[PDB]
Amino acid sequence: ASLLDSNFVPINFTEFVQAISNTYKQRRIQFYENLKR
Amino acid sequence: LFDENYYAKAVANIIGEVKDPIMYKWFSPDQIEDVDLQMGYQKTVKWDAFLNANPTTIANEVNTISTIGFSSEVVRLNYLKLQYKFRHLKQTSEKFYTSDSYIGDINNNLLPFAQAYKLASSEIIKLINHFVLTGTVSIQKDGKNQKRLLPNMYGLLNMPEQIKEEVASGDKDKMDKIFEKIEAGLSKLELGDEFSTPMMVIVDPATSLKLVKPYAAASSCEKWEDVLIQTIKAINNREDVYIETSNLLKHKILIYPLNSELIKFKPSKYMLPTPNEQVDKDSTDVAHSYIDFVLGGLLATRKTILQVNIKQS
Amino acid sequence: INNNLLPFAQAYKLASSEIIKLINHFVLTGTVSIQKDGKNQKRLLPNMYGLLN
Amino acid sequence: TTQLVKEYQEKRSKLEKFMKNPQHDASLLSNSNEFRDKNVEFFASGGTRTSKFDKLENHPFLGYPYKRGVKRVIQHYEPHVEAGGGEDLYGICIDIDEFSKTATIVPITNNFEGYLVAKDSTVKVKDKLIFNKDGALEKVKATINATALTDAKQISNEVYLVKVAVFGNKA
Amino acid sequence: TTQLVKEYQEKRSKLEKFMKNPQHDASLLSNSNEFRDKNVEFFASGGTRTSKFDKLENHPFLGYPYKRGVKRVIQHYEPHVEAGGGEDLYGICIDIDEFSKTATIVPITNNFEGYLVAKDSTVKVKDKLIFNKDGALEKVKATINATALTDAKQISNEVYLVKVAVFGNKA
Amino acid sequence: LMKNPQQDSGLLSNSIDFRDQNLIFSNSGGVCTSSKDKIENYPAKGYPYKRGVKLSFGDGTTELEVEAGGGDDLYGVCSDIDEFSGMATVIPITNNFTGYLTLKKDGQNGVNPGDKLNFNQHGELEKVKSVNAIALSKAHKLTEDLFIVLASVFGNRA
Incomplete structure (x- = not known):
C-alpha cells in the first residue's frame, strides 16, 4: 500500500x-x- | 480515483522528486517511531522497580521476606496541525500557457500544479526541519515574530531541564574557554547507566571552522575536533561520537546521546506534507490548493542534553 | 496507576533487572547495601569478597 | 483568568501534597538509574518486610490517615478510622484507596516494619517513639514499643518518613 | 485536608465559570425534551444566522475574549487578539479552541447576528449598543451600529447574553 | 514601477534559505487570503499597483477606470496588475485585506507595528482618520524611493 508500487491503485483520498x-x-x-x- | 482526481494523480507522480529531510541524520533508526493521529495529545507510561530493603537469607524456616516496590511516571506530548495554501494553474488551462521551453505564466508568476506542489513541499520540509532542530516556528532570519505554540512542544534547543552553558562575549574566539565550558557541561551531564551509548554533536559552520584548526605555543597532528571527540569519549565509555554541521544553528553547540531509552522522536504519521482534497475552483484559470503538516513529538529525559551558546555580543 | 500494580510478567522483568543490578554491585564492591552512603550493609559470611574489598 | 489559573494550580499542589500517588503530567522523564535510595518516597505502600501471615483490614476513613496510626471512631453509618494515637490507638494505616475511600490497616496486635510519618526531624536511630494525637511518630509514658531504625528523611515541606518497627504494647 | 478540598472546589468553579464548555460530570441526566428556549446557553457557539460566504480569521488570544469584541495587540511573538472595544475594535470572537488557545474572529467588515456578552441586565429591544473597554455590550460615541434584538438573559451572576446584529460602522 | 523588473538579471537565484524571501515587489496578493473574498478587475490608469485606488471618470465615450488615490475618494486597494491587458485587480474597501502596501517616503523610520495608517492623495500609506489601517511590521526598503509595509485594512471608521 505505497505509491512506489505501480500496481497499487487507490480508490479514494483516504487510501x-x-x-x-x-x-x-x-x-x-x-x-x-x-x-x- | 486517479481517473477522477488529476491533482491526486499529479501528486502521486511528483511525490518521488521531493528530497528526504535532513533531520533524519540527527537520530538513530531506533530512536524514531511513528504514531497515528493528527492533532491532540498522547500519554506514555514508564514503569520502574526499586528495592525496599536488604534481601533475606533462606535458612531453616522463614516467612518474612523483603519487598520490591514499583512506581510509574506519565508524560504528555502535545501535537499540532498546520496548513498552507498556494495558487496554481487549472489543468484544462495548462495547454494555453505551455511553451517550447517551459509551462506557466512568467509575467504573473503562475506555475503548473506539480511544480508548485513540489516547491511548496520543499519549503514546508525546510520549516519542519527548522522546528525539529530549534523548537520554534518563524520565517524571519532575525528569529522574531514567532508563532506561539502549545506547551509540551519542545525541540532539542529549547528542551527544559537540560544543561546550558554560556561562553562570554570576550572569549567568543577563545577555543580554550569554549572547551572549558564544554567540559563543564559534559561533567554536569547525567546519563545514568545508559552512558555506554553513541553521542551526537551539532555545530554551526563557524564553530566547525574553528574546530578544524590545529589543537593548541602550538602543536600538530591533532585538532580541536579530535580533542572534543576524546573528551566526549571520556564520558560515553569510549563509544562512537558523531559530528554534524547545520546552518540553522548560530554560535551554538548541541550534544546529546543516540539512545532511544533517553531521547525518542515519536512523530505523527502525517507530519510530512500531505495534499488536501479541497481545491478552490473559479471561472478563471487560477486554482488554489492546500497542504497539511503535523508538528510535535519529541521526548527526552531530564539533564541529558548539553547546549553551549557562544555570546557574539 | 493509582495503586502501582503491574502484571506478573512486567513486575518480574523489573524485579530481575534490579536484582541483577544488585548482583553486579556486589561483584564489584564486595558489599551489599541499598543506601547511597553505604551504611546498613547486610552482614555476609566470611570468605565472601569482591574485587574492591 | 490567569490569576484564577494560578490559584487553581496552588490549591491543586496543596491538595496533591496530601496524597499517596498524586497524578501529574510532566514534560520530561525523570531519570533514577541509581538503584540506591530509590525506595524513600511517599508512594511506597506496604512495609519493607511483609509476611504471608499478616492480618490486613480495610476500613472507611475520615481525613487522610495514610502512613499514620489510626483509631476507631463510632458516630447512621458504620464506624470509621481516624488518624490518632495516644491510648486510643487501634492500628496503623499501611495502604489507602481514594476511589473507594478505604484504608488498609494492620492491627496493633501484629508487628510491622516500615516507613511512617514523623512529627519532625528530631528523631535518631535507637529512639523510643510515641504516636501523637495526629497519628505521627514523635520522640519520647509510651503505651506501645516503637523504635526508629533510621533517621528522619524529608521529601516535602512537612513530609518526614522514618523507618520504624512496631512490635506490640508496653506494660 | 477538607479545607483544601473546599478551596479546590471553589477555585475550579470560579475558573470553569469563564469557560465555553466546562466539563462537569453530573450524577444524573437532565430533562430538555421541550424544544423551546434551548439556544440561550454559554456554549452556543457561532451565530443565529450564518452565511456560507462569511470571513473567519483565527488568531492566538490572551485572556478570555469569547463572545466579546476583540482588538489587535502587537508585541517576540505574533500579534494577538485581546478583549477590547472603543475605537480599537477589530472584530468579534465567535469561537475558541482552548486546546490550541486559538480564537476565531469575524472582521468588522462583515455583518453578524448572534448572542454576545452584555454589561448588565439593563438592555431592551431596539436599543443602540456600544462595545466597552472589556469587549462587553452596553447601552448608549457609537462608532459602530449595533442594535439589540432581544432582552438581556441571565445565566450566571455576570453571564448576560443578548441577541445583537452588528452591521458595520457609523459615520 | 513594475510588477516584474523591466531589467533582466545576470545571476541565478540561490534557493537554499527559506527566511525573509518574501520581501519582494513581485509578491502579489495578500499574505493571508480567504477563499470567500470579493475580487474585481478594472482598466488601469497609471500604475496603481500596491496602492489604494479611486474611481476616475472620463468624458463619457470610455468606461470608468481606477487611479492611485485616497482620502475621501478611496474605493479599494489594488493587489495585482495584468500588464498585457492593463487590468488592475481591486479588493473593495468593504472587504478585509492584509498584505504589503506602498508606504510614504517620509518618516518611514517612525512606522512601527501597531501604528494607525491612512491613505494619502497618491495611494500611499502614511502614519496618522477615516480609514482603518494598522501597520503590522516596519518599513522594508526595496529601492531608494520604494518602501513597502505589512498592513491590514478593515474598512472605514467613523
Whole structure:
C-alpha cells in the first residue's frame, strides 16, 4: 500500500493519504538502511 | 480515483522528486517511531522497580521476606496541525500557457500544479526541519515574530531541564574557554547507566571552522575536533561520537546521546506534507490548493542534553 | 496507576533487572547495601569478597 | 483568568501534597538509574518486610490517615478510622484507596516494619517513639514499643518518613 | 485536608465559570425534551444566522475574549487578539479552541447576528449598543451600529447574553 | 514601477534559505487570503499597483477606470496588475485585506507595528482618520524611493 508500487491503485483520498504515509515511512527506512556515518 | 482526481494523480507522480529531510541524520533508526493521529495529545507510561530493603537469607524456616516496590511516571506530548495554501494553474488551462521551453505564466508568476506542489513541499520540509532542530516556528532570519505554540512542544534547543552553558562575549574566539565550558557541561551531564551509548554533536559552520584548526605555543597532528571527540569519549565509555554541521544553528553547540531509552522522536504519521482534497475552483484559470503538516513529538529525559551558546555580543 | 500494580510478567522483568543490578554491585564492591552512603550493609559470611574489598 | 489559573494550580499542589500517588503530567522523564535510595518516597505502600501471615483490614476513613496510626471512631453509618494515637490507638494505616475511600490497616496486635510519618526531624536511630494525637511518630509514658531504625528523611515541606518497627504494647 | 478540598472546589468553579464548555460530570441526566428556549446557553457557539460566504480569521488570544469584541495587540511573538472595544475594535470572537488557545474572529467588515456578552441586565429591544473597554455590550460615541434584538438573559451572576446584529460602522 | 523588473538579471537565484524571501515587489496578493473574498478587475490608469485606488471618470465615450488615490475618494486597494491587458485587480474597501502596501517616503523610520495608517492623495500609506489601517511590521526598503509595509485594512471608521 505505497505509491512506489505501480500496481497499487487507490480508490479514494483516504487510501491515497495512507499510501503517501506508507511511502514516506518506506523512504525513511531506506535512508536509514543506506546511511553510513 | 486517479481517473477522477488529476491533482491526486499529479501528486502521486511528483511525490518521488521531493528530497528526504535532513533531520533524519540527527537520530538513530531506533530512536524514531511513528504514531497515528493528527492533532491532540498522547500519554506514555514508564514503569520502574526499586528495592525496599536488604534481601533475606533462606535458612531453616522463614516467612518474612523483603519487598520490591514499583512506581510509574506519565508524560504528555502535545501535537499540532498546520496548513498552507498556494495558487496554481487549472489543468484544462495548462495547454494555453505551455511553451517550447517551459509551462506557466512568467509575467504573473503562475506555475503548473506539480511544480508548485513540489516547491511548496520543499519549503514546508525546510520549516519542519527548522522546528525539529530549534523548537520554534518563524520565517524571519532575525528569529522574531514567532508563532506561539502549545506547551509540551519542545525541540532539542529549547528542551527544559537540560544543561546550558554560556561562553562570554570576550572569549567568543577563545577555543580554550569554549572547551572549558564544554567540559563543564559534559561533567554536569547525567546519563545514568545508559552512558555506554553513541553521542551526537551539532555545530554551526563557524564553530566547525574553528574546530578544524590545529589543537593548541602550538602543536600538530591533532585538532580541536579530535580533542572534543576524546573528551566526549571520556564520558560515553569510549563509544562512537558523531559530528554534524547545520546552518540553522548560530554560535551554538548541541550534544546529546543516540539512545532511544533517553531521547525518542515519536512523530505523527502525517507530519510530512500531505495534499488536501479541497481545491478552490473559479471561472478563471487560477486554482488554489492546500497542504497539511503535523508538528510535535519529541521526548527526552531530564539533564541529558548539553547546549553551549557562544555570546557574539 | 493509582495503586502501582503491574502484571506478573512486567513486575518480574523489573524485579530481575534490579536484582541483577544488585548482583553486579556486589561483584564489584564486595558489599551489599541499598543506601547511597553505604551504611546498613547486610552482614555476609566470611570468605565472601569482591574485587574492591 | 490567569490569576484564577494560578490559584487553581496552588490549591491543586496543596491538595496533591496530601496524597499517596498524586497524578501529574510532566514534560520530561525523570531519570533514577541509581538503584540506591530509590525506595524513600511517599508512594511506597506496604512495609519493607511483609509476611504471608499478616492480618490486613480495610476500613472507611475520615481525613487522610495514610502512613499514620489510626483509631476507631463510632458516630447512621458504620464506624470509621481516624488518624490518632495516644491510648486510643487501634492500628496503623499501611495502604489507602481514594476511589473507594478505604484504608488498609494492620492491627496493633501484629508487628510491622516500615516507613511512617514523623512529627519532625528530631528523631535518631535507637529512639523510643510515641504516636501523637495526629497519628505521627514523635520522640519520647509510651503505651506501645516503637523504635526508629533510621533517621528522619524529608521529601516535602512537612513530609518526614522514618523507618520504624512496631512490635506490640508496653506494660 | 477538607479545607483544601473546599478551596479546590471553589477555585475550579470560579475558573470553569469563564469557560465555553466546562466539563462537569453530573450524577444524573437532565430533562430538555421541550424544544423551546434551548439556544440561550454559554456554549452556543457561532451565530443565529450564518452565511456560507462569511470571513473567519483565527488568531492566538490572551485572556478570555469569547463572545466579546476583540482588538489587535502587537508585541517576540505574533500579534494577538485581546478583549477590547472603543475605537480599537477589530472584530468579534465567535469561537475558541482552548486546546490550541486559538480564537476565531469575524472582521468588522462583515455583518453578524448572534448572542454576545452584555454589561448588565439593563438592555431592551431596539436599543443602540456600544462595545466597552472589556469587549462587553452596553447601552448608549457609537462608532459602530449595533442594535439589540432581544432582552438581556441571565445565566450566571455576570453571564448576560443578548441577541445583537452588528452591521458595520457609523459615520 | 513594475510588477516584474523591466531589467533582466545576470545571476541565478540561490534557493537554499527559506527566511525573509518574501520581501519582494513581485509578491502579489495578500499574505493571508480567504477563499470567500470579493475580487474585481478594472482598466488601469497609471500604475496603481500596491496602492489604494479611486474611481476616475472620463468624458463619457470610455468606461470608468481606477487611479492611485485616497482620502475621501478611496474605493479599494489594488493587489495585482495584468500588464498585457492593463487590468488592475481591486479588493473593495468593504472587504478585509492584509498584505504589503506602498508606504510614504517620509518618516518611514517612525512606522512601527501597531501604528494607525491612512491613505494619502497618491495611494500611499502614511502614519496618522477615516480609514482603518494598522501597520503590522516596519518599513522594508526595496529601492531608494520604494518602501513597502505589512498592513491590514478593515474598512472605514467613523
